[PDB]
């Protein structure tokens, strides 16, 4: 009875398709977990700079998010967002770098608005180690730092973090990779 045979093959095909997708999503979940940090410090490694720069220039992929990082095991959940070809007043001329508060499982227990000092950095891979960076005290009246209602608050940071020329002509890029670092002050709490 081939109709029966075909129906079962079809069910199996569909279930194999679902499993193949769950498997790929778990691979992603592993990477996220393996690169998580719980002391308020993020190191974000961005490979294939050239291709990714070009995808932002072409408007295919304007921005990238880091993996999440945390101020503590059950603390604020955060990430970074970078625009390789720049955003706002830095579009086309700069790399723009922003900080992001994400909805965390424990937000009901944490102080809001978010008020930890944040430091944004681009790492120098040259032997001089002249890292680019700046820090800010979050503005309490910015919606960037409100208790999250959606998955992610609006990003906040530096549209003109570094000129693209400075970036590309220095020692920040090596083996077609850059390293971004974010430091959130945690000494303040709990």
């Amino acid at each position: 009875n081939t109709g029966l045979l075909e129906s079962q093959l079809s069910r199996h095909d569909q279930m194999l398709s679902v499993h193949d997708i769950r498997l790929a999503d778990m691979d992603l979940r592993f990477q996220v977990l393996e690169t998580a940090s719980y002391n308020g410090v993020l190191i974000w490694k961005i490979r294939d700079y050239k291709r990714r720069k070009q995808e932002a220039v072409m408007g295919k992929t304007l921005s990238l998010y880091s993996q999440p990082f945390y101020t503590g095991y059950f603390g604020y959940k955060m990430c970074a967002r970078v625009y390789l070809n720049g955003d706002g007043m830095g579009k086309g001329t700069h790399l723009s770098l922003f900080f992001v508060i994400m909805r965390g499982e424990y937000d009901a227990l944490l102080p809001w608005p978010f008020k930890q000092k944040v430091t944004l950095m681009l790492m120098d891979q040259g032997s001089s180690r002249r890292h680019l960076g700046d820090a800010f005290k979050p503005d309490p009246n910015s919606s960037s730092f409100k208790k999250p209602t959606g998955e992610m608050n609006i990003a906040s940071g530096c549209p003109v973090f570094v000129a693209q020329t400075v970036l590309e002509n220095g020692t920040y890029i090596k083996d077609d990779t850059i390293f971004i670092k974010v430091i959130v002050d945690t000494s303040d709490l709990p």
Binding site: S63, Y83, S96, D134, S142, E151, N153, G157, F161, V162
Partner: peptide, 14 residues
């Protein structure tokens, strides 16, 4: 380094 005034990126989260 020219970030004396931290501002939001242009619009959209998620």
């Amino acid at each position: 380094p020219s970030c004396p005034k931290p501002v939001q990126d242009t619009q959209p989260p998620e």
